[PDB]
Symmetry: D2
Subunit: 233 residues, 4 copies
Amino acid sequence: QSMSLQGKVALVTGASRGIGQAIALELGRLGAVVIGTATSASGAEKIAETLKANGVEGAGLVLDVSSDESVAATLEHIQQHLGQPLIVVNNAGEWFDVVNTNLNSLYRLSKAVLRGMTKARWGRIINIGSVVGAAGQTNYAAAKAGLEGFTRALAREVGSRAITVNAVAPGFIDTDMTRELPEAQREALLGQIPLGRLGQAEEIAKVVGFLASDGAAYVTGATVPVNGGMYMS
Amino acid sequence: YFQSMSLQGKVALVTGASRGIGQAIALELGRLGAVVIGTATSASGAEKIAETLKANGVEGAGLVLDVSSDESVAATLEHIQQHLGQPLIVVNNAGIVRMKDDEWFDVVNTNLNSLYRLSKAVLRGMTKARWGRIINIGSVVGAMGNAGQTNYAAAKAGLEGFTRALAREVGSRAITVNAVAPGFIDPEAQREALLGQIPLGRLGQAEEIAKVVGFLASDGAAYVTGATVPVNGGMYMS
Amino acid sequence: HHHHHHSSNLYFQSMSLQGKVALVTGASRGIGQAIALELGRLGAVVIGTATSASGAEKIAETLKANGVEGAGLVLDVSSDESVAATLEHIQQHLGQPLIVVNNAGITRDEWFDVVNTNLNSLYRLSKAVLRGMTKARWGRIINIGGAMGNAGQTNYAAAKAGLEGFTRALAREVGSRAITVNAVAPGFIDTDMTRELPEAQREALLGQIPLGRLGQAEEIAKVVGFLASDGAAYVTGATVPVNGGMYMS
Amino acid sequence: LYFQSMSLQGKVALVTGASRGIGQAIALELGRLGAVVIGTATSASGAEKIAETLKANGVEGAGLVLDVSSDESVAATLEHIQQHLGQPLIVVNNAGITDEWFDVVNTNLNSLYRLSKAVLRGMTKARWGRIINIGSVVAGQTNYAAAKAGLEGFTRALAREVGSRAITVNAVAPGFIDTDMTRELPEAQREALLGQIPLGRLGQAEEIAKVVGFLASDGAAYVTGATVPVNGGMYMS
Ligand SMILES: O=C(c1csc(-c2ccsc2)n1)N1CCc2ccccc21
Ligand SMILES: O=C(c1csc(-c2ccsc2)n1)N1CCc2ccccc21
């Protein structure tokens, strides 16, 4: 179809579980060669097995997005063995230090992969926001504000080169980190969601898949909220 | 049955489908497998829609619909229900000296009343099926000055607010409500100046709007509601 | 039978609004009343409106009791006839209002009709008073949000979105004429409805507000007073949120 | 009714980057409202100029050297103020710092945080406070809109963290202001720029200062986390 990513190398950070894993499989399903990262070797191996078990070509790697050395080395590894990643999905992650640290990691990784996208005159950077999950509202709303601003600016800097930069802002998603919130807090959160249910990780992955397609080529600087109608600021 | 982005077995209603973006949306939804009903305000335009659909192998019809009239809306909807079935995908693209910065209010207010009128009518069928997609298309940037920016930004502001609220009203029923906000989509040779406000350096294509709409209509966009997806190549006027 | 028009050497340093005539709609209670007194305190001649003659009289008494020159009038902002007549009345007897504060709203398909009705009333009233502001080449229109917090969460974000868009657009249409158009978006304000909540729910509500307290009506009035001053002359199209740090989207 | 405290008599205000333009205008406005004002610059010449301006306008205070990018500069300066003048309860951040898009915004917000944190002990102590952050005055749209986005988000979050203590945290987002940068634009570009501003004119530095003066008063006590745009109707996002 025209949703196809055949011939594209996608890099998905933090792909051993939940939303990251779901994004890796979705992009794989659309035909991309997928490289998923975790911070440990056990997690890199688990990614590799998941990809095999779902008929997706690619690899798992160890990547620490807080380290320039990790980013440089990893990127070079990918370039030699697989090719240049033109689809990059940032999902890997003191109110201030959290947001500030994250956005610096977004920038670090974003900058590094841009040489390859520039060279090809085509690209997709997609940034995944933090999931709503029980200091909590303050940090969430801030991390979302910083992401929206960041994404918009970067999109402006790189647009001339045919590179889109977008974000996806999850609401309350069904994941391992959310499955075991207390009932009281879960129920409260359901009560603020017009659809009356948690989102699925796959439902985030679908949005990401579309932003990566050629059909989303005029969409850039956007933050698509995926939250069942619940908007927390 | 069950596939990523198939609309097989869905009836989609696309208003203002005789040209440009509306036409592109009708063909995109048809391509994805929906049975498409496209409307225009004139009979000539209804006929042209029918031909386009036939010429592209899309099952459906062209109809005359005036979204400003409760009678037109009722009658048309009843016609569709008897002959084709219940539309569960509805796409609102019908919207009404040089332009000035005092035309903003009547235009926006009239459009949102029409959005509501139509939205309300099709909701009984979506409620009854416990599934639905309403997608509202914004106006493309209409003119080159402040007066052009005033009307655009306002029509967008009202659409964002409207869409969000309606989504909240109908969410419990598994009905998503979203918008698409086009930027500059495909005369006077301040062309270059205009392209210089757009990071991608080009006008958008009507097909590029249609793709976004097609996704919002799919099962994969089921958790997306109340959103206004901007499709403007990186150029943001508020 | 109902009289619908009711009137009434110490120089306070607060008196910045120099005889100017301010019109404050819905001024019989709460935030509207607080705005009328604040503008009066700053030296304006204040005309406050209600929809009934009893309310027009109560406004007049409040203004008298606080040493504020002006009047209470009957005004129905949903009616072109009421708006025209009232505004002509004001012109003949008191002068041309150059400060106008829209606080007369409407409350409880309900979601759309409320917002849509209010914005039409805003436009109706705003259009009418503009001839006088145009003629003077100076003006202040201020719209009070219903984008009230007690009005609650379900329709709040929408009423705010419509107000913010509206305010911004009108500001653009009238700016060349030295007329500012701005809004004030209250959060949770202390009024008689909000006082009589159970402790259990009161505490929950206060726990969503960083300042840990309800706002006072006077605190909204102060913001309005500033937007009306010459110092806020470069502020236009703005919606100032006044909610103690609680932001609902 | 007629008698209340929109006065700042008895308050110590700290205004960073106060040697010219908007900073200077803010320092004189707060002084005019009765505050004891401490204005900072990065050079000693600028600290002197601030002191003269304050003297010349009958405003009690001082000019100091402050580098908001340095923890040592911030600590020392604050301690100096505490010993000699008292505890600043009004703080106005107008001092900024110099593919440059991210580092600028990121550096500024780190400075905002550094300074904000330091002055909070004193505000906490008194259970009252005003922090006000001034945005940058107008590739050009990218940097402006970003710096505004990061400020709006920052301001809002900090306001949440400190609200229980009766401390408001707000921002002012200037549009096109009449200052040294704008005095040297070509007529062609000037006219184009005015044409995008509904009021049809540049803002004055004093017009920013008035907004700041209000946010510092007791009447703005329920306003927190807000970014007040002061741009004559011209909104770039
Ligand atoms: O009815 C309006 C409306 C009428 S005019 C208008 C507008 C907005 C910006 S300029 C004019 N908005 N709105 C705007 C937002 C909204 C939400 C829910 C129901 C109604 C509405
Ligand atoms: O630290 C940043 C930050 C660093 S760069 C940046 C940014 C935002 C828009 S473009 C760059 N934002 N932010 C942005 C918003 C925010 C809120 C609370 C704590 C931190 C932050």
